[PDB]
């Protein structure tokens, strides 16, 4: 009844943010269950914070141009959503960015409010020609998973404000592949290899620890039905 060989999660690091996780020989047919549940929970269930709206001075929602900046508004939207923010206010919070003169405006030069931290100051947001004139305020809100952009009537409240897509999940992707391994003359053992790509804010192994605890709680909710024993170790 007991599993012939107990699994054991192991780690293989190729970069400070990219990592690989292997499960040793596992019971036959259990690779896909664990692999796909882990992928989805890791991509979605973990919480985080990311921007939700942006406001640019002297610009309308239909007016896609911004004076004083060579770059356009859509690439600016892409760059801001790329930026990672760690927030804990649990309510919408605004962050300001005011800069003039020609040069480059980067995440380093952003001034964050109290209790909100920008993990990556290296990213360049805009390039200025002539007088910069750049004034911008962006809202940050903690969230879970991934939410597409929607209209909250903020454009009606203020014409400059526009929606933007958000990445609440600390992780960027998970690509799990399952292969067969031979144990004690038997080939009916599945090895699961999970490749987690995460942003610089969170270490991937902590993200999988959180995902595993979430899954453990969610499935141990099923223990309430009845106490039963299954062969293990």
């Amino acid at each position: 009844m007991l599993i012939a060989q107990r699994p054991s999660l192991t780690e293989e690091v190729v970069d400070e943010f990219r990592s690989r996780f292997v499960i040793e020989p596992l019971e036959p047919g259990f690779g896909y269950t664990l692999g796909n549940s882990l992928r989805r929970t890791l991509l979605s269930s973990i919480p985080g914070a990311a921007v939700t709206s942006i406001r640019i001075d002297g610009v309308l929602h239909e007016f896609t141009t911004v004076p004083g900046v060579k770059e356009d508004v859509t690439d600016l939207i892409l760059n801001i959503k790329q930026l990672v923010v760690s927030s804990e206010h649990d309510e919408p919070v605004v962050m300001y960015l005011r800069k003039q003169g020609p040069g480059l405006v980067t995440a380093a030069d952003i001034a964050p409010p109290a209790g909100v931290e920008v993990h990556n100051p290296d990213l360049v947001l805009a390039t200025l020609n002539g007088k910069g004139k750049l004034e911008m305020e962006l809202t940050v809100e903690r969230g879970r998973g991934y939410v597409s952009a929607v209209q909250n009537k903020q454009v009606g409240q203020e014409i400059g404000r526009i929606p933007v897509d958000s990445i609440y999940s600390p992780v960027l992707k998970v690509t799990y592949k399952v292969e067969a391994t031979r144990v004690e003359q038997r080939t009916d053992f599945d090895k699961l290899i999970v490749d987690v790509e995460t942003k610089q804010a969170m270490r991937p192994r902590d993200a999988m620890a959180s995902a595993g605890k979430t899954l453990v709680e969610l499935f141990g909710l099923a223990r309430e039905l009845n106490i039963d024993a299954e062969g293990i170790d």
Partner: protein
């Protein structure tokens, strides 16, 4: 090949929901596809990190700037479909981006060019990646007979 053709196809293959939006990275777009708002067959603007060689026809065009820029080897946005991004990231990072439907003739073309310009090991790895992706997206293609 059916699966690869499905992976890179133009619109009208389904109701192109979530079309006309720009995604910060291929990974975010995959997130959107998983959420179901985006569909695999839909034109969108996708960024590419540095080192991603651009399409052969993208070399003359580039971004707008008053300073010299070299988009042959740095970031660049592109109006394509997520399926084409997946097809190219099966191909090696050195290969120029392919933005046209693959079918069967063009697949033979790119395979021949790979066999000409690349070492045998990379050719075999690319063939295996193409095989795996083709089977996966042929399963997901939902071709049937009724």
């Amino acid at each position: 090949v059916l699966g690869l053709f499905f992976l890179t196809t133009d619109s009208e293959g389904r109701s192109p929901k979530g079309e006309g939006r720009a995604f910060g990275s291929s990974a975010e777009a995959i997130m959107a596809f998983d959420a179901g708002d985006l569909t695999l067959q839909a034109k969108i603007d996708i960024r590419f990190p540095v080192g991603t060689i651009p399409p052969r026809g993208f070399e003359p065009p580039a971004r707008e700037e008053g300073e010299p820029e070299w988009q042959q080897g740095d970031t660049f946005t592109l109006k394509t479909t997520l399926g084409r991004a997946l097809f190219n990231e099966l191909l090696p990072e050195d290969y120029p981006f392919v933005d046209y439907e693959v079918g069967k003739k063009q697949l033979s073309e790119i395979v021949n060019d790979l066999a000409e310009r690349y070492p045998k090991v990379i050719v075999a790895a690319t063939l295996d990646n193409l095989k795996a992706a083709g089977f996966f997206w042929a399963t997901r293609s939902g071709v049937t007979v009724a």
